[PDB]
């Protein structure tokens, strides 16, 4: 019995040792993401910043082209969500 007591205690042990090994790497992948996501956070800043400073221009009709030609817009009220929704 005592043999049984110890013989398999060890095999699993090995297995658990093995699993542990596997567990180790995962954590590295982890630190890497942490840093990858930190870089992503820095990048998000510039984009949002630039979008904040944006120019919206209404071309208007300086040319004076007939409205017939100027009619290039949907005449259908369309439902699109904004902000919340």
């Amino acid at each position: 019995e005592i043999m049984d007591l110890l013989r398999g205690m060890d095999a699993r042990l090995q297995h658990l040792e093995q699993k542990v090994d596997k567990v180790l790497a995962q954590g590295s992948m982890v630190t890497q993401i942490k840093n990858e996501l930190s870089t992503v956070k820095t990048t998000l800043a510039t984009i949002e910043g630039m979008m904040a400073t944006v120019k919206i221009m209404d071309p208007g009709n300086p040319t004076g082209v007939p409205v017939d030609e100027l009619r290039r817009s949907f005449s259908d009220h369309v439902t699109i969500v904004s902000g919340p929704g």
């Binding site: 120019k55 221009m57 209404d58 004076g64 409205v67 817009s73 902000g83 919340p84 929704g85």
Partner: protein
């Protein structure tokens, strides 16, 4: 019929240059017009046009032949003649030359009659004023303290009005206008004969036709042609010039201005001759320069002279654009112009806003007007998203804070965006106020938050909006129907296309004539998207009258459906969303409005009696923003308003439709220049076309624009951390920048610190308004440490300056209303005189002026008869006896005269009972000597008129004396009745009833044929009944000239009526002949009434005798109210004086105190503390239960029910007479009505733009105390007493006086007086009649509500 539908008396239409060009080219009239001046008219085949309009060419050829005959040199071509042909803006410096003095006798007879009539009462008017002063102050110098100089009596006023400059010119142009209007009437009626008038005065040859007048002056060798509109324009201007110059000559307050004004006129007149139609630009600069001059006197160095210098640089630019004046000449002219604005008091400088309309108006061309709106619109405009989101975030914050403070302190239905932080979530959950300090940060969550449906708004909420006439444009096809047929006939002849169908339909008529009209379906034009696919849509502008600036010279008209949607949207915004913000202090109630304005202007005026508060005011003009509004800057606000209202797409319409339609300026005499462009879609952005306008239109969607501007103002205030109180209104906003300074600091340093604080907010506001895309220039923004501008009136150091000359400039000799009765005109003159009293001019002068001008009007109407009468017996009896004219003009209107201004009206706006005030005034005149006591006896003994039970109840305080109702009001009523009987609209289904008049009579008999007759309660109950609601709906109709014309056309007046309308003035004079001619034999007991008898007692007796046929001796109760002047026996205590009343028994008085050392326009520390004066107290219930959301039909029922009980009785029969009456407008049961009815105790019985009652100069330093008085009639009496005391203190120190070297006290004792009496009412009264069969509109929602309670 044509004798009622007369040509206009004054200017109500824009001046069209091409109309004059058409009339002068049509007859080949001599001219030196260059080809470019004619514009499109030069290419017209004028031979074909002359072939048609044969009568017009006959007349024009005749006048041309006569010009050639009298002056041969007009034949000479190439301008080799010395005669110069000039147009309107160039005839300015010559109009005095045209005299026509000889060969004209009517103006002379008019002047002599007015002189003779005035000479018989001037002495009496002076005695009246003296007696008023003695009985209101105890001293005889109440009105003469400021001037004592010269005291102008009525005789002096008439002399200086008739002997001033412009007097001969005014008489000449009045004669010209009278002749021209006779000619227009004759041409309408189709006489075809003698329609040319040739006065042929020496050195002034004038030929008048129904179309135009040719005027030639030999002294200057100048000939001009004037159309009818321009003739009305010239005569109105010249009357304004006469009025301003006279008033300046008379009033010692406006005396220093006189010479200056004259100089200014001359200079601009000469400038006009050099410039022409552009000189008005200089005029439009002057309206700004006045403010600049005020800004020249501010303590802050950095803000002194900026506006002055900039406006001077603009005037130089204007003088030097056409190179008329070199730089040196331009500088002189500028210096001459400015020297007239210097060395004047602040209100005299503000008084110079009268001269804007003293030089007339520019001649308008459609192309030039279209150019400005083409440059403003259709232009690239940059906008900043952040600025737009930040202002949307603050918009949402204000909307959330507005739903709260209402809706029981809870947030509106809202969904929070995924960014909303934990803090915003908590705030939503706890329904807590959003701090603007919070809102400034985190804007990325305050915005992006949907305020889901919050309002249950219905398009049919308000009925008054649908029944107001608005101009409607013709469909897109048939859009040239506006133009004259002659001009476009040829163009369509070469196009092989049919002639357009002319358009005349009106919006009100089209609504009224619709079998099926549902506002929920009317809005489906916009919600469903049909407005974008509709090919018959067309919007067009039309030239605006009485405008001297390029912007605002055109107003727009749209199609019927799109106008209906616009009015529904505006009503929806005003009813629900607009109430939710108050950051702006503008309110519908004028009293609180001026209270808020006065507090705003007195923010920084703190005295000595630590930190103090300082104010810097910033006023910006908002006229050009409407054209600068783009879709990007209104889309999120529109998108949240739509959510809140539940509609998917109602707003955002103005821009979306305008991008896809070509607008145009519609003038009948201004056709398109190119005869080949005959369709609107293809049009180019030139001439009169504006292709794809991207901006909004004036008035349209104004609520949303004001809402966004308020959001931007709050945003800028929060960014700069500065407290402000905006006053945003349409076209002008005022902001009172508030800061905290050191109390011990010097006044100049205090304002310097205030300006330094305001600089940051001004910069932030400029940046914010630029972000939403509306650039702010130096013209629009005006920064002052002393004053701001609201509703064209300035608020200078705790005062509103006078600007009385502007009011007197619009005082002419006839009212435009169709009837043109003498009563109407005298009422208009009286109203302008009241405005003059409120605007600082001497009250004695105002009273004399009112008497003089009422005399002047009647004499003018007598000697210039509008309609020819076969029998001239009445007009001869009046012309040959000026005593009759004086007696009738001095007689109060309520007694049958034309004196619509009472002595009490000089002091207090609110009157109460007009017949007591009228009796007071007639007593005064009798005791002075103006009128005789037999006139009063005749009025007492006058035979009762033709009155019905409805006539006593509809208008209480009115006697049963015929012809007190002007023809005008009758015409309005006839138009309203004709349109509603013709109305077929589903909303107006049950409103009209053929038995309306007899139902009114029966109900009025029910309420009034009782033991005691109480006309006030009858009026309230009628107006709250179903029949009264129907009358109110019928009264919502506009009743405009065009509407009156339509009504008279489709429903012709009967022959007798036609005559009684035509000869109303003659019948009125004949009716009054019985009381103002000789002492009539009267009943004897009338010897009891004396001039010493209290007015109230005489009013009671007169009402008892006048309605004797109706009432059979029963007395009238609930009407009488003491006259304000006769109730108070004042006494002014100066120095060692003491009050006689107080010292002799009397003990009831209203104490007024004005301190010593008040020097206006000086250091606020020196003068005593300032405060908002008593400007009046409006209506201010604890019913057994407060029903919220009560319909209009329910609150009405509970007030009727209530007043019946407080008045007729508290019994159960009395109750069975209130439940039935309320049942005509509600479906409540007896128990619910009884319990929901408010308290039937002390029923107020109250029932029925920016005009201040006074300058509030010395009234802001006064102390009031009614501690020695008893104290809802008594409340009104004591409020009137306080207002009278305020007016007395103000008139003691007139605007000429700017200092108080002594402390004054007023006691104004109201006790010890005849007028005060005990009040007894609420006695039980049976109905003495069965309940009338009241036909009720059960189905109609606006009259009856089947479910008033949930």
């Amino acid at each position: 019929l044509n004798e009622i539908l007369l040509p206009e008396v004054h200017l109500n239409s824009p001046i069209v240059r091409y109309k004059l060009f058409y009339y002068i080219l049509h007859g080949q009239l001599p001219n030196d017009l260059e080809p470019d001046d004619l514009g499109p008219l030069a290419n017209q085949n004028w031979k074909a046009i002359r072939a048609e309009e044969s009568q017009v060419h006959a007349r024009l050829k005749q006048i041309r032949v006569e010009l050639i005959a009298r002056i041969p040199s007009l034949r000479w071509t190439r301008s080799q003649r010395e005669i110069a042909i000039l147009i309107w803006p160039r005839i300015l410096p010559i109009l005095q030359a045209y005299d026509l003095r000889q060969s004209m006798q009517l103006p002379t007879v008019w002047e002599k009659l007015t002189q003779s009539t005035v000479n018989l009462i001037s002495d009496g008017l002076e005695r009246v004023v003296l007696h008023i002063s003695n009985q209101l102050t105890g001293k005889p110098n109440l009105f003469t303290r400021s001037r004592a100089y010269s005291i102008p009596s009525t005789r002096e006023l008439s002399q200086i009005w008739f002997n001033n400059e412009w007097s001969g010119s005014v008489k000449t142009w009045l004669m010209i206008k009278y002749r021209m209007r006779q000619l227009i009437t004759n041409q309408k009626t189709g006489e075809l004969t003698d329609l040319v008038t040739i006065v042929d005065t020496r050195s002034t040859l004038c030929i008048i036709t129904p179309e135009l007048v040719a005027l030639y002056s030999s002294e200057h060798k100048a000939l001009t042609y004037l159309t009818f509109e321009m003739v009305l324009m010239v005569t109105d201007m010249l009357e304004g010039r006469l009025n301003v110059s006279s008033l300046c000559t008379a009033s010692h307050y406006l005396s220093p201005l006189k010479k200056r004004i004259e100089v200014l006129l001359t200079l601009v007149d000469d400038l006009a001759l050099l410039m022409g139609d552009k000189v008005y630009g200089i005029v439009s600069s002057l309206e700004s320069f006045v403010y600049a001059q005020l800004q020249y006197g501010d303590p802050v160095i950095d803000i002194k002279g900026t506006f002055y210098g900039f406006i001077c640089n603009e005037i130089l630019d204007l003088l030097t654009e056409d190179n008329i004046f070199t730089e040196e000449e331009a500088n002189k002219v500028l210096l001459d112009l400015t020297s007239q604005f210097d060395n004047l008091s602040p209100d005299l400088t503000a008084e110079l806003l009268c001269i804007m309309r003293l030089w007339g108006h520019p001649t308008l061309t459609a192309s030039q007007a279209a150019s400005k709106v083409r440059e403003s619109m259709c232009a690239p405009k940059v906008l900043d998203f952040q600025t737009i989101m930040k202002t949307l975030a603050f918009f949402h914050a204000i909307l959330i804070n507005g739903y709260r403070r209402s809706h029981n302190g809870i947030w509106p239905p809202t969904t929070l965006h995924g960014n909303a932080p934990k803090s915003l979530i908590e705030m939503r959950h706890d329904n807590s106020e959003l701090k603007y300090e919070y809102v400034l940060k985190n804007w990325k969550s305050i915005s992006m938050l949907r305020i889901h449906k919050c309002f249950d708004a219905s398009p049919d909420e308000d009925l008054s909006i649908f029944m107001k006439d608005k101009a409607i444009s013709c469909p897109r096809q048939d859009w040239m129907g506006v133009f004259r047929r002659s001009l476009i006939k040829q163009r369509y002849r070469d196009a092989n296309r049919p002639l357009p169908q002319p358009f005349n339909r009106r919006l009100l008529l089209n609504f009224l004539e619709d079998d099926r009209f549902d506002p929920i379906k009317e809005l489906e034009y916009v919600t469903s998207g049909e407005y974008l696919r509709d090919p018959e849509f067309c919007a067009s502008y039309s030239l605006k009258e009485k405008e001297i600036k390029a912007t605002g010279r055109i107003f727009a008209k749209m199609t019927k459906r799109m106008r209906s949607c616009q009015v529904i949207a505006e009503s929806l915004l005003a009813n629900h969303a607009g109430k939710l913000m108050r950051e702006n202090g503008v309110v519908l109630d004028q009293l609180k409005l001026t209270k808020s304005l006065l507090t705003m202007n007195q923010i920084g005026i703190i005295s000595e009696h630590g930190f103090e508060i300082a104010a810097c005011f910033l006023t910006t003009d908002l006229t050009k923003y409407c054209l600068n509004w783009r879709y990007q800057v209104i889309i999120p606000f529109a998108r949240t308003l739509n959510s809140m209202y539940g509609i998917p797409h109602l707003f955002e319409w103005i821009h979306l439709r305008l991008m896809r339609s070509t607008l145009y300026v519609g003038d009948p005499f201004n056709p398109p220049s190119d005869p080949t462009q005959l369709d609107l879609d293809t049009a180019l952005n030139d001439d009169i076309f504006i292709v794809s306008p991207r901006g909004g239109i004036e008035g349209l969607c104004q609520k949303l624009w004001t809402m966004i501007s308020i959001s931007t103002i709050i945003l800028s205030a929060t960014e700069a951390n500065t407290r402000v109180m905006s006053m945003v209104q349409g076209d002008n906003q005022a902001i009172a920048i508030t800061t905290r300074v050191v109390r011990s600091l010097s006044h100049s340093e205090k304002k310097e610190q205030a300006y330094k604080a305001s600089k940051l907010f001004f910069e932030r506001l400029r940046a914010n308004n630029h972000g939403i895309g509306h650039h702010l220039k130096e013209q629009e923004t005006i920064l002052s440490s002393d004053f701001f501008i609201y509703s064209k009136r300035v608020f200078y150091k705790g005062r509103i300056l006078t600007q009385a000359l502007k009011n007197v400039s619009k005082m002419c000799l006839t009212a435009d209303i169709l009837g043109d009765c003498s009563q109407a005109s005298c009422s208009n003159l009286a109203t302008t005189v009241m405005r003059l009293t409120e605007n600082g001019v001497e009250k004695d002068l105002c009273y004399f002026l009112n008497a003089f001008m009422t005399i002047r009007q009647l004499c003018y109407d007598l000697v210039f008869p509008q309609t020819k009468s076969l029998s001239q017996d009445i007009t001869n009896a009046y012309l040959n006896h000026p005593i009759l004219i004086s007696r009738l003009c001095l007689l109060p209107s309520q007694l049958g005269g034309l004196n619509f201004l009472s002595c009490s009206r000089l002091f207090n706006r609110n009157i109460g009972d007009p017949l007591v005030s009228a009796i007071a005034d007639v007593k005064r005149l009798i005791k002075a000597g103006c009128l005789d006591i037999w006139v009063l006896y005749n009025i007492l003994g006058r035979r009762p008129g033709k009155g019905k039970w409805s006539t006593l109840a509809a208008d209480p305080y009115t006697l049963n004396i015929d012809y007190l109702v002007p023809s005008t009001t009758f015409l309005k009523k006839h138009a309203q009745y004709t349109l509603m009987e013709r109305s077929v609209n589903p909303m107006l289904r049950g409103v009209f009833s053929e038995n309306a008049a007899e139902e009114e009579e029966e109900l009025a008999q029910y309420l009034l044929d009782r033991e005691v007759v109480m006309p006030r309660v009858a009026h309230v109950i009628l107006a709250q009944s179903s029949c009264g609601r129907r009358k109110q709906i019928q009264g919502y109709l506009d009743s405009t000239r065009t509407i009156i014309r339509y009504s008279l056309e489709v429903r012709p007046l009967s022959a007798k009526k036609l005559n009684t309308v035509i000869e109303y003035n003659l019948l009125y004079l004949s009716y009054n002949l019985e009381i103002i001619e000789k002492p009539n034999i009267v009943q004897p007991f009338l010897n009891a009434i004396n001039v010493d008898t209290c007015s109230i007692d005489i009013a009671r007796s007169l009402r008892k005798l006048s309605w004797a046929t109706l009432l059979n001796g029963r007395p009238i109760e609930g009407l009488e109210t003491p006259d304000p002047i006769e109730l108070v026996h004042g006494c002014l205590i100066i120095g060692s004086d003491e009050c006689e009343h107080c010292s002799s028994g009397d003990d009831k008085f209203t104490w007024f105190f004005l301190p010593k050392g008040i020097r206006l326009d000086d250091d606020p520390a020196s003068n005593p503390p300032i405060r908002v004066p008593y400007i009046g107290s409006k209506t201010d219930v604890a019913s057994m239960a407060y029903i919220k959301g009560a319909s209009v039909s329910l609150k009405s029922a509970l007030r009727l029910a209530g007043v019946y009980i407080w008045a007729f009785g508290d019994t159960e029969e009395s109750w069975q007479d209130a439940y039935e009456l309320a049942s005509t407008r509600v479906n409540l049961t007896l128990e619910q009505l009884q319990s929901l009815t408010p308290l039937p105790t002390s029923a107020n019985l109250v029932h029925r733009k920016f005009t201040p009652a006074s300058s509030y100069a010395f009234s802001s330093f006064v102390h009031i105390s009614n501690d020695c008085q008893i104290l809802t009639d008594s409340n009104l009496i004591y409020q009137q007493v306080m207002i009278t005391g305020l007016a007395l203190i103000e008139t003691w120190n007139n605007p000429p006086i700017n200092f108080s070297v002594y402390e004054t006290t007023l006691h104004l004792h109201t006790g010890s007086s005849c007028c005060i009496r005990p009040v007894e009412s609420c006695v039980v009264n049976p109905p003495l009649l069965p309940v009338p069969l009241i036909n009720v509109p059960q189905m109609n929602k606006f009259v009856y509500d089947p479910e008033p309670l949930s």
